Design an enzyme around this catalytic site. Structure first.
Site, PDB file in Angstrom:
ATOM      1  N   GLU A  61     -16.664  38.168   5.945  1.00 51.72           N
ATOM      2  CA  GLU A  61     -16.006  39.111   6.836  1.00 51.72           C
ATOM      3  C   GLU A  61     -15.421  38.395   8.050  1.00 51.72           C
ATOM      4  OE1 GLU A  61     -15.888  42.946   6.656  1.00 51.72           O
ATOM      5  OE2 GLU A  61     -14.197  42.063   7.751  1.00 51.72           O
ATOM      6  N   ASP A  89     -19.590  40.865   2.592  1.00 50.40           N
ATOM      7  CA  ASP A  89     -19.557  40.448   3.989  1.00 50.40           C
ATOM      8  C   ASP A  89     -20.155  39.068   4.218  1.00 50.40           C
ATOM      9  OD1 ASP A  89     -18.523  42.888   5.595  1.00 50.40           O
ATOM     10  OD2 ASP A  89     -20.117  43.780   4.389  1.00 50.40           O
ATOM     11  N   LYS A 115     -22.572  53.196  -0.506  1.00 54.27           N
ATOM     12  CA  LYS A 115     -22.239  51.793  -0.718  1.00 54.27           C
ATOM     13  C   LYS A 115     -22.629  51.339  -2.117  1.00 54.27           C
ATOM     14  CE  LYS A 115     -20.561  49.541   3.042  1.00 54.27           C
ATOM     15  NZ  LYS A 115     -19.074  49.541   3.021  1.00 54.27           N
TER      16      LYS A 115
HETATM   17  C1  LIG Z   1     -12.242  44.178   1.577  1.00 57.17           C
HETATM   18  C2  LIG Z   1     -13.241  44.555   2.669  1.00 57.17           C
HETATM   19  N1  LIG Z   1     -13.755  45.768   2.882  1.00 57.17           N
HETATM   20  C3  LIG Z   1     -14.596  45.679   3.941  1.00 57.17           C
HETATM   21  C4  LIG Z   1     -15.400  46.833   4.535  1.00 57.17           C
HETATM   22  N2  LIG Z   1     -14.728  48.140   4.735  1.00 57.17           N
HETATM   23  C5  LIG Z   1     -15.480  49.285   5.307  1.00 57.17           C
HETATM   24 BR1  LIG Z   1     -14.587  50.987   5.564  1.00 57.17          BR
HETATM   25  C6  LIG Z   1     -16.947  49.119   5.690  1.00 57.17           C
HETATM   26  C7  LIG Z   1     -17.625  47.808   5.489  1.00 57.17           C
HETATM   27  O1  LIG Z   1     -18.764  47.679   5.785  1.00 57.17           O
HETATM   28  C8  LIG Z   1     -16.870  46.658   4.914  1.00 57.17           C
HETATM   29  O2  LIG Z   1     -17.511  45.430   4.728  1.00 57.17           O
HETATM   30  N3  LIG Z   1     -14.581  44.421   4.363  1.00 57.17           N
HETATM   31  O3  LIG Z   1     -13.747  43.742   3.576  1.00 57.17           O
HETATM   32 MN   LIG Z   2     -19.619  45.818   5.393  1.00 58.24          MN
HETATM   33 MN   LIG Z   3     -16.589  43.486   4.577  1.00 54.91          MN
END
Ligand SMILES: Cc1nc(-c2[nH]c(Br)cc(=O)c2O)no1
Ligand SMILES: [Mn+2]
Ligand SMILES: [Mn+2]
Length: 179
Positions: A61, A89, A115
């Site tokens: 991330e 992440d 999730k």
């Molecule tokens: C591709 C990608 N998606 C994300 C993402 N999007 C949201 Br909404 C919440 C999260 O916790 C998260 O890691 N990061 O990279």
């Molecule tokens: Mn995330």
């Molecule tokens: Mn992410």
């Protein structure tokens, strides 16, 4: 909007700049989508804290899609771990598994279920943090030691209390943007 000023006051300039990129590059205005702006800042900060509290963690991330997928592919080629369908992440070298970090204003179990249903890949470890100091992890394996999770929980609760002191927490909690 006071939410923008709070974001610029309580978050590191680097985190604010990364969130502004993630939003404006994809067509979103941090001045309009203030709750999403704050949520992205908080999620990035949590991921960075997670990683710093390890060396043990590779941060996916905070990167552009190109670099993130490059890092994921390199990790997969070196360790042989299956490639995630969705960008995770972090990557834990000690436990050798990708980690998806979630920050929610709702109950930790609801966000965890969402999730898990999203990433239909059991190998990606999920860790959900809340703003009330609660957590939920796959198989109850919280990966980190008590002190690191305590620091993250304190930071999250402090962000929530600062929002409340500025009359921003209600709008932020009733919104699901960022989760
Ligand atoms: C591709 C990608 N998606 C994300 C993402 N999007 C949201 Br909404 C919440 C999260 O916790 C998260 O890691 N990061 O990279
Ligand atoms: Mn995330
Ligand atoms: Mn992410």
């Amino acid at each position: 909007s006071a939410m923008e000023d709070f974001v610029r006051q309580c978050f590191n300039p680097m985190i604010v700049e990364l969130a502004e990129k993630a939003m404006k590059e994809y067509g979103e205005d941090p001045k309009i989508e203030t709750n999403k702006f704050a949520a992205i800042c908080t999620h990035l900060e949590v991921c960075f804290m997670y990683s710093d509290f390890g060396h043990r963690f590779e941060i996916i991330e905070g990167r552009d899609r190109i670099m993130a997928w490059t890092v994921v592919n390199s990790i997969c080629n070196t360790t042989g771990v299956e490639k995630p369908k969705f960008l995770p992440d972090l990557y834990d070298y000690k436990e050798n598994r990708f980690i998806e970090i979630g920050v929610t204003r709702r109950e930790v179990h609801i966000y965890y279920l969402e999730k898990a249903n999203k990433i239909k890949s059991e190998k990606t470890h999920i860790h959900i943090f809340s703003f009330t100091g609660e957590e939920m992890a796959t198989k109850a394996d919280y990966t980190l030691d008590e002190e690191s999770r305590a620091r993250i929980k304190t930071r999250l609760f402090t962000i929530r209390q600062e929002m409340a002191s500025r009359s921003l927490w209600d709008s932020f909690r009733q919104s699901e943007r960022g989760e």
